[PDB]
Ligand code: CHL
Ligand code: CLA
C-alpha cells in the first residue's frame with residue numbers, strides 16, 4: 001500500500017478525471033475536446049450535453065444537487081424491490097412479496113404482518129403512517145437543506161461528518177474514485193428501477209418473476225412477446 | 234408579514250436556509266424562494282415565467298370558480314341537467330342544445346361548430362390584443378397594464394396594491410393546485426367533486442381515498 | 453436543536469413570529485415562548501411558575517407511570533383485584549384491606565385513617581423540608597438542589613445536564629396532558645384506560661370516540 | 672532492473688477485449704450441427720440453466736448431462752478471452 | 765518488451781521480498797489496510813472486541829454440525845456453543861501469556877511507511893496494549909459465541 005501521491009488538483013486515479021477521460025462513444029466522443037462548460041473536476045461528468053439543458057453554472061450545480069439525491073433514493077429502491085421476492089421463494093411467509101400490493105397488505109387481514117411473524121409492529125393505521133412520514137421526512141429534508149443536529153450542514157452534496165461511522169472520509173484521491181463508484185452504481189439503480197416500472201406497467205408480474213420466466217425460455221419469454229399488447233384497435 | 238424584503242415568509246420558514254438564491258430577493262409578489270431545480274435562472278426567461286404564471290393563475294382561478302358555482306346553484310334551487318362539469322361540455326349534443334341555466338329562454342346553442350369558429354375568432358382577437366395591446370388604450374405593460382381595466386380605482390395606494398398582487402398570486406397558486414385536484418378526482422373516481430365534498434362530509438373516514446385505490450391495477 | 457438561545461424550537465416553528473416576548477429568551481429549559489395570555493410577566497411570579505411547573509411535572513410523571521404499570525402487571529402474570537386505578541383507592545374497604553400485589557403476605561392495610569394520619573405527618577414533613585431544606589444537607593436551591601439526591605453523579609457535565617433539564621420539562625408537560633386525558637377518560641367512559649387502549653387497538657375506527665358522545669345529553 | 676515500484680495498472684484494460692471475447696465466441700457458438708439434433712452449445716443448455724432454475728433450492732443431479740455443457744462451454748470461453756487479452760499487440764507482434 | 769509487472773520492494777532489490785500483483789495490487793492493498801489488525805490509530809481494546817466477535821461467531825459452527833452431539837435434536841446446538849466458548853477461553857489465555865513473554869523486553873528502533881515518511885510505532889506492541897487487546901478478545905469472543913446460539917434459535921430457515 002502506497003500513499004497515492006496527490007500534491008496536485010487533477011484526480012487521474014486510473015484514467016478517470018482529466019482531459020483524457022473515458023467518454024461515451026469509443027471514437028465519436030464529444031466534439032472539440034468536449035463542450036467547453038464541463039472538463040472533469042467532478043464525479044459523473046461523461047459528456048451527454050446533447051440537448052444542453054443546463055448551460056448555466058448554477059444549473060450545472062442544481063441538477064447535480066438533484067442527481068446525487070435521486071440516485072441514492074434509487075439504490076435503496078432497487079434493493080427494497082429485490083429482497084423479499086427472494087426470501088419468499090426460499091422459506092418466508094409475507095402475504096404477498098410482489099411489490100404492487102406490498103402496500104395493500106394493510107387491508108388484507110389485520111394490518112401488516114412482518115416477515116410472516118405475528119409478534120411484531122402490526123401497523124393497522126394508514127393515517128398514522130402518513131403522519132409519521134410527513135412529519136419525520138419533512139424534518140429530515142429540512143435538516144438536509146439547512147443543517148441541524150448530529151452534524152451541521154456544510155456541503156449539501158456530501159456532509160461527511162459524525163454521520164459516517166467508518167471514518168473513511170480522509171484520503172481525497174481514493175474518494176475522487178469512490179464519489180464516482182457512487183454515481184456509476186446509482187445510474188445502475190436508476191435503470192434497474194425503470195426495469196421495475198416499465199415491467200410493472202406491461203406485464204404486472206414481479207421483477208424476479210420476470211427473470212425466472214425469461215431464463216425458462218430466453219428466446220420466447222421476453223419483451224417482444226408483449227409487443228402486440230397496448231395497440232389501438 | 235414582509236414579503237417585499239429579505240424577511241419574506243420563505244419556503245420552509247424557520248427551516249429557511251437564509252442563503253437564498255440571489256437572482257430573486259423580494260421586490261416582486263409571490264417570491265417565496267423555492268427553487269430546487271432552478272429552471273428560471275435567466276432573467277428574461279424569469280420575466281416570461283412571471284407573465285406565464287400570472288396568466289395561468291388568472292385562468293385557473295376563473296376555472297376554479299367555474300367548477301364551484303354551477304353545481305351548488307343546481308343543488309340549491311335551479312336545474313341544469315348535468316351541472317357536474319363533465320357532461321356540461323356535452324350538453325349541446327343531448328336533446329336540445331346547450332340551454333343556459335337549464336332554461337329554454339336563454340342561449341340555446343344548437344351547433345357546436347359555430348361556437349367553435351366564433352370562439353377561435355374572439356380568442357385570437359383578445360389574445361393578440363392582450364400581447365400587443367390595442368383597444369381601451371395601447372398596452373404599455375405586459376404584466377399589469379394600469380389602463381382602463383380597473384374602473385373602480387383601487388390601484389392608487391402602492392403598498393395595498395402590492396399586497397393585492399401577493400394575494401392574487403397566492404390565490405392563483407391555490408387555484409392551480411386545486412384544479413389539479415379536480416382533474417385527479419375526474420380521473421380516479423370520475424364523479425362530482427362537490428358530490429365528493431358531500432360524500433366525504435357524510436363519510437369522513439370510512440370512504441376516504443383508499444377504497445378508490447385498487448381501480449387502476451395492472452394485470 | 454438550540455433551545456438555550458434565540459434559535460429555540462419555538463411554539464409554531466415555521467410560523468414562529470420572531471418578535472418573541474422579551475421577558476424570556478432562552479437560558480432556562482422549557483422556554484417555548486407560548487404566552488398568549490401572559491400570566492407570568494412578573495419575574496418573581498415567573499420563578500414561582502418555574503418551580504410550580506417543575507413540581508407539577510414531577511408529580512404528574514409519577515402519577516402517569518403509576519397509571520400505566522399496575523394494570524399491565526395484573527394483565528400479564530399477577531392479580532390485584534381491581535388493578536384499574538378507580539377502585540384501587542377502595543381496595544381497603546372491600547373484604548380484607550389493601551393487600552399489596554394482591555398477596556396476603558404484604559402491606560395488608562386495614563384502617564384507612566391510620567394511612568391518613570401517617571400520610572399527613574410524613575407529607576407535611578417532606579414538603580416543609582422540601583421548601584426550607586433540612587436533612588441530607590440544607591436546601592440552598594429551590595429549583596434543583598444538587599446535594600445528595602443524585603447518588604449516581606450525572607450532573608457533572610453542564611450541557612448534557614441542561615439537555616436533561618429540557619427532557620425533564622418536556623416529559624412533565626406530556627405527563628400532565630396525558631393525565632388530563634386519563635381524567636377525561638375517567639369521566640366520559642369511566643372504564644380502564646388500558647382497557648381503552650386494548651379496545652381501540654381491537655377497534656380502530658368503529659368505536660373511536662363519538663359512540664361515547666351522546667351520554668351527557670341534557671333534557 | 673525489473674522495476675522500482677509496482678505499477679497500479681498492470682491489466683491494461685482495453686474495453687473491447689471482453690465484448691469481442693464472449694460476443695465473438697458465442698455468436699458462432701450457437702450454430703447447429705448434425706451432432707446435436709439441430710441444437711446449439713448455447714441454447715441446448717439454456718434449456719438446462721432455466722430447467723433446473725425452475726425447482727430452485729434443489730441442487731441439480733450429479734449426473735445430469737449439463738455439467739458437460741457448463742465445463743465445455745467455459746473451457747472455450749475462458750480460452751478465447753485469454754487469447755483476446757494477448758491482442759495487446761501494442762509493442763510485441 | 766519494455767513492459768514488466770513484477771518489481772522488487774520499493775526499489776531496493778536486496779530485501780528478501782519482491783512485489784507481485786498478489787501482494788501489492790491496489791485492491792488487495794486497500795483491503796488489508798482496512799482490516800482491524802492494521803489500523804494503528806484506534807485503541808487496542810476495540811480491535812480486540814471486533815476480532816473476538818468475528819472469530820467466536822465463526823468458531824461456533826463446526827462444533828454444532830460435526831460434534832459428538834449433532835444428531836440428538838435441540839441439544840446439538842447447546843453442546844457446540846459451549847465447546848466453542850471453551851475454545852475462545854483458551855485463546856484468551858494464550859494471548860495473555862504471549863503478552864507476558866513477547867513484549868517483556870525493549871522494543872525495536874525505527875519504522876517508516878512504504879511511500880516514505882516516519883510513522884510512529886503501533887501502540888498495540890507494548891505490554892499494556894497487548895493485555896488490553898487480550899481482554900477485548902475475551903469479551904468479543906464470548907459475545908460472538910453467545911450470538912451464535914441466539915442466531916441459531918431465531919433465524920428464518922436455519923437447518
Ligand atoms: C399535607 C400538607 C401539605 C402541604 C402543607 C403542602 C404544601 C404545598 N404544596 Mg403539596 N402540600 C401538602 C401535601 C401534598 N401536596 C401534594 C401535591 C402537590 C403538588 C402537585 C404541588 C404541591 C405544591 C405545594 C405548594 C403550594 C400548593 C398550593 O397552593 O395548593 C393549592 C391547591 C389546591 C387546594 C388544590 C388544587 C387542585 C387543582 C386545581 C386540580 C385541578 C384538576 C384539573 C382541572 C383536572 C381534574 C380532572 C381531569 C379529569 C379534568 C405548598 C408548599 C405545588 C408547588 O410546590 O408549586 C411550586 C405543586 O405543584 N403539592 C400531595 C399529593 C396529593 C400532597 C399529599 O399529602
Ligand atoms: C433526475 C435525474 C437526473 C438529473 C437531474 C441529471 C442532470 C444532469 N446530468 Mg445526468 N444522468 C441521469 C439522470 C439525471 N441527470 C441518469 C439516469 C444517467 C444515466 C443515463 C445520467 C447520466 C449522465 C451523464 C453520463 C452525464 C450527465 C450529465 C448531466 C448534467 C447535464 C445534462 C443535462 O442537461 O441533463 C439534464 C437532465 C434532466 C433535465 C432530466 C430529464 C428527465 C426527463 C424526464 C427526461 C428523461 C426521460 C428519458 C430520457 C426517456 C427515456 C427513459 C429511459 C432511458 C429509461 C446535469 C447535471 C452530464 C454531466 O454534467 O455529468 C454529471 C454527463 O456527462 N448525466
Ligand code: CLA
Nearest residue numbers: 263264265266267268272273282283286289406409410413
Ligand atoms: C405551470 C405552472 C407554473 C409555472 C410556470 C410556475 C412558475 C414559477 N413558480 Mg410556481 N407553482 C405552481 C405552478 C407554476 N409555477 C403551482 C401549481 C404551485 C403550487 C404547488 C406553485 C408553487 C410555487 C412556489 C412555492 C414557488 C414557485 C416559484 C416559481 C418560480 C420559479 C420556479 C420555476 O422556474 O418554475 C418553473 C415551472 C415550470 C417549468 C413548470 C413545469 C411543470 C411540469 C409539468 C412539471 C410539473 C410536475 C409536478 C411537479 C407534478 C405534481 C403536480 C402537482 C404538484 C400540481 C416561477 C415563476 C418560486 C418563486 O420564486 O415564485 C415566484 C417559489 O418559491 N411556485
Ligand code: CLA
Nearest residue numbers: 482483484485486487491492501502505508625628629632
Ligand atoms: C397548572 C399547570 C401549568 C402551569 C402552572 C404552567 C406554567 C407555565 N407554562 Mg405550561 N403547560 C402545561 C401546564 C402548566 N404550565 C401543560 C399541561 C402543557 C401542555 C398542554 C403546557 C405547555 C406549555 C407551553 C407549550 C409553554 C408553556 C409555558 C408556560 C410558562 C408561561 C405560561 C404561564 O404563565 O402559564 C400560567 C399557567 C397557569 C396559571 C395555569 C392555569 C390553569 C387553568 C386551570 C386553565 C387551564 C384550562 C385549560 C386551558 C383547558 C384545557 C386543559 C388541557 C389543555 C389540559 C409557565 C411557566 C410557556 C413557556 O415559556 O414555558 C416555560 C410555553 O411556551 N406551557
Ligand code: CLA
Nearest residue numbers: 827831832833842843844845846847848849850851853906
Ligand atoms: C484427560 C483429558 C481429557 C478429558 C477429560 C477430555 C474430555 C472431553 N473431550 Mg477431549 N481430548 C483430549 C483430552 C481430554 N478430553 C486430548 C488429549 C485430545 C486430543 C487428542 C482430545 C480431543 C478431543 C476432541 C477432538 C473432542 C474432545 C471432546 C471431549 C468432550 C467429550 C464429552 C462429550 O461427549 O461431549 C460433550 C461436550 C460438551 C457438553 C461440551 C462441554 C464444553 C466445555 C467442557 C464446557 C465449557 C464451559 C464454558 C465454556 C465456560 C464459560 C466461560 C465463560 C467466560 C463464558 C469431553 C469434555 C469433544 C468435545 O468436547 O468437542 C465437541 C470432541 O469433539 N476431545
Ligand SMILES: CC1=C[C@H](O)CC(C)(C)[C@H]1/C=C/C(C)=C/C=C/C(C)=C/C=C/C=C(C)/C=C/C=C(C)/C=C/C1=C(C)C[C@H](O)CC1(C)C
Nearest residue numbers: 268269270271289292293296299300318321409410412413
Ligand atoms: C414550481 C416548480 C419548481 C420546481 O423547481 C420544479 C417543479 C416542481 C416542476 C415546478 C412545479 C411546477 C408545477 C407544480 C406546475 C403546476 C401547474 C398547475 C397545477 C397548473 C394548473 C393550471 C390549470 C389551469 C390553467 C386551469 C384552467 C381551467 C379552466 C380554463 C377551466 C375551464 C372549465 C370550466 C371553467 C368549467 C367547465 O365546466 C369545464 C372546464 C373546461 C373544466
Ligand SMILES: CC1=C[C@H](O)CC(C)(C)[C@H]1/C=C/C(C)=C/C=C/C(C)=C/C=C/C=C(C)/C=C/C=C(C)/C=C/C1=C(C)C[C@H](O)CC1(C)C
Nearest residue numbers: 487488489490508511512515518519537540628629631632
Ligand atoms: C400554559 C398556559 C398558557 C396560556 O396563556 C393560558 C393557559 C392555556 C390557561 C395556560 C395553560 C395551562 C394548562 C393547560 C394547565 C394544565 C395543567 C395540567 C394538565 C396539570 C396536570 C396535573 C396532574 C397532576 C399533577 C397529576 C398528579 C397525579 C397523581 C399524583 C396520581 C396519583 C394516582 C396514582 C399514582 C395512581 C392511583 O391508582 C390513583 C391516582 C390518585 C390517580
